Amino acid sequence: SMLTLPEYNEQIPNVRSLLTKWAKVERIQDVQDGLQLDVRLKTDTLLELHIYYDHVYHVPSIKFRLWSLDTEEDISSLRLLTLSDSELRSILNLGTFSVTLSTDMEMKSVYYYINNCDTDANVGSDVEHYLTRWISLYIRIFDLNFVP
């Protein structure tokens, strides 16, 4: 893949544009390095989808974190969640895909770096609808009911 940063950022507002279709998406926020949305996997579970480009392979990446909304008192609180793959699959859809979960030095924060090393292999070279064919391709790991 040769999709540069300015090449993938050109379709940044294209991914979210379709991402809007997501029924779980409750919040829509863009960033200067991808996008930041708030997917509501569960009424008490929030999955912060964080998209970021990687010049490593010249392609976009995927990084999300599970959250646990706790309204014990009804303050709209939440707390990062952490489970194994089998448990992480209870919501996400890996199937044959691959993911890499790593914790921080403080072991208080972690992320779910989805395997996006060989995207062109799956997505392709179509730089036209890549950001779409990519997300819509990597979205099947979050929602198999939402086909953008």
Side-chain angles (χ1 to χ4, degrees), residues 34-115:
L35 259 136
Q36 176 283 288
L37 336 74
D38 220 14
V39 190
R40 194 86 88 206
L41 274 71
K42 209 180 291 254
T43 280
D44 305 57
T45 316
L46 171 295
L47 184 285
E48 219 67 75
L49 178 298
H50 313 154
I51 187 173
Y52 82 83
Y53 178 98
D54 198 13
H55 324 255
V56 173
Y57 280 87
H58 268 285
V59 266
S61 307
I62 284 144
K63 152 166 100 153
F64 63 69
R65 303 156 40 151
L66 295 161
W67 289 96
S68 140
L69 279 128
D70 295 319
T71 32
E72 275 202 298
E73 330 192 282
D74 213 88
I75 79 288
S76 197
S77 238
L78 64 85
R79 178 106 108 176
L80 185 70
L81 295 177
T82 38
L83 71 195
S84 313
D85 283 57
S86 168
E87 306 212 77
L88 155 287
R89 203 269 215 190
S90 198
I91 32 185
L92 294 193
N93 287 288
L94 297 276
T96 184
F97 272 125
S98 288
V99 68
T100 289
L101 182 169
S102 191
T103 39
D104 212 41
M105 189 152 120
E106 209 168 7
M107 269 153 91
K108 69 91 204 269
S109 147
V110 34
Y111 324 78
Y112 275 102
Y113 305 97
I114 301 198
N115 273 237

